[PDB]
Design a protein around this nucleic acid. Sequence first.
RNA 1: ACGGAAGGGCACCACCAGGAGUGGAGCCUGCGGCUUAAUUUGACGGGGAAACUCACCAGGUCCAGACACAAUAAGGAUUGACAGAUUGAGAGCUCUUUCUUGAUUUUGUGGGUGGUGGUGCAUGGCCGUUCUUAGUUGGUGGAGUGAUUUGUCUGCU
Lengths: 103, 37, 262, 46, 158
Amino acid sequence: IIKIRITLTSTKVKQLENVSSNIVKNAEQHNLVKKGPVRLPTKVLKISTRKTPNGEGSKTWETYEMRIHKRYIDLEAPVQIVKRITQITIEPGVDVEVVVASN
Amino acid sequence: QCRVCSSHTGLIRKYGLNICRQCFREKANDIGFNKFR
Amino acid sequence: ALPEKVIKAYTTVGSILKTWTHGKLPKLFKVIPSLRNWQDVIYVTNPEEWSPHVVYEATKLFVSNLTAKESQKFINLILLERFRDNIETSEDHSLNYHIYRAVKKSLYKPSAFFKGFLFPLVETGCNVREATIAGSVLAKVSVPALHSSAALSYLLRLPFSPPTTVFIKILLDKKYALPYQTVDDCVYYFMRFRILDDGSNGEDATRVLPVIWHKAFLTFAQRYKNDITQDQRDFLLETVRQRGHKDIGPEIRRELLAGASR
Amino acid sequence: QYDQIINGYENYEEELEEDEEQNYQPFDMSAERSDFESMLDDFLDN
Amino acid sequence: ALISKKRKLVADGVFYAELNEFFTRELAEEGYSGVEVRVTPTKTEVIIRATRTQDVLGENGRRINELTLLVQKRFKYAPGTIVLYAERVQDRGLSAVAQAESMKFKLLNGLAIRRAAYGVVRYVMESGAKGCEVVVSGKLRAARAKAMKFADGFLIHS
RNA sequence: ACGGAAGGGCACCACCAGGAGUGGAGCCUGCGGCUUAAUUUGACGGGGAAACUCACCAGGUCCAGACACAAUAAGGAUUGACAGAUUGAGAGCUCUUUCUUGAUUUUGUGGGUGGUGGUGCAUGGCCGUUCUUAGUUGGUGGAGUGAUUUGUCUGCU
Ligand SMILES: [Mg+2]
Ligand SMILES: [Zn+2]
């Protein structure tokens, strides 16, 4: 009997939501008790970059961006279900994390 | 120095990446930094 | 596992040897060559995080205080590592001058160098840079005729690549006294590149051979034309006929013809 | 002369394997120099 | 170990970037298509999707070792915590010759009939095969003749 | 091509109406200038900054030459472990030892090793800029021997 918390972090929402809905429906279709995929605020990391490369012309400015989305799902299952689901769900772009403790 | 082009100058020493701005602007797309706005 | 005394003392000495630039080396670092297990102790000092100065000076100390096998283990596990690491991680892909002078201090024992530096280098992804640099090392340093002949005879049996031919060229430009067996390995090397019409060829038979192979063939045919038999000379003049150069081919052939068999 | 050294150059990994098989010893303090921990004590006292 | 989350992920992006760069520069004459790095509990698996693996896996596998050590020596991995696999050409699970000799040597060495065939079919289907079929015909230590088919995945016959 | 013929835009790096100012003051900071043994240097240099960064100064040190070649050398050419002499500002540096020695020669010559020698030619190519293409192009057709022309225009938009 293991009560585990899972947290995903990704920049591409399609792969992240693919993995999220996969884990959701795969966790309920074999009867588990869970808290649905809770959605943390998409943090938008921006980088201010000067328009001027060569010292010609006045100084005006620009901006680069990244959107980082994070989800979390809570579950209760044995050791084998967690191992197998963690091995099966591995995807590129999406970063999965499995924590066992509840403190 | 910039771990790409032997340059003491331009160094983005932030986050431990240490690429000068010229090379970091090129490697930006391979690192993960893309043009949104 | 080691005593915690050794752990803390040589982690302290390993924090000393990160920044050391002049004066005298630590007392605990100069008593390591005298140890029966210097290799369990030299790791606590953290070998990859010494400054180039400590690389040069530890090279001097350990290649001048250890035996041949111990100098080989040292030059292989630390010097070759730091060499490749400073060439690979630098940004003009150059080598520091202290690591260099250290390689020059590891070629004072040519057996330890060749067996521990050159040979595990050439057989682990020796690119053109590391061999321009190590080729410069070997091209600058004076090495005994016996260890030079043996290293030559090892580089000859190696798979063909432009760096290894740079090396063979360099050891042939030495123009020392090779035993008849070394000259045999040379002739066999320069033989393996001809095309056998009877149905037995590898890739060396039809491949494009650089300027360095014809220069090494030229220097070989220049210094050791009197130390090859008539048969081997006919095989080599055959390799000249098939795989000859526009300008160097005729001069290699002329340097084989102007010689007396043994 | 030559036949002795080329079997050591060409087969240096096998001769290193045999030298390391015959002559490997674990860290022993009483089998080093016996005035060595005298130097461990002499350096660690500054 | 232990870098801040954003810095961890960005440095992993830089890692993939740099290894992709090095692998595009090195395996240019081996039809290199791409790479994928899988982080596992014990080791790190750098899979090389290169459309000429017979050269990437040279004599005695040498050219892979020589590469791993490189991707080790500069990135400072502990000897054994980095492993390079190839994907396309010299994948011995896509050559029916090596698997009929694998089955011949599985039955000759004295294994089982279903373990040899399901093991060979699973290994073929693990190496990136669209499908596999293995037919075992004969006596099977009996007095009457028997034929078995071990099909898995997807094949075309016409 | 060019116009400083005229005509339109169409604009707060233009003007109106203002608003806040700056220029005057102290202090900061960059540039010039002078001064300096040096006051590193480019035209913001991520150029923030007592060591570092230093690229500039006053001195003290190392390490040189691949090699070839001629003498020496084993009854010594000279390389390594140390202790005191040291020793000036800090290190080395040399000679008396206990010692390793043990040809790595010491010294003098030459064409170039060394190119961890930089400059140039050709070739492939990557990053920086421009006509920063924002009205051009060519294709058939017509006219002209031709440069050229028409398309690409009176109109109106
Ligand atoms: Mg016309
Ligand atoms: Zn750069």
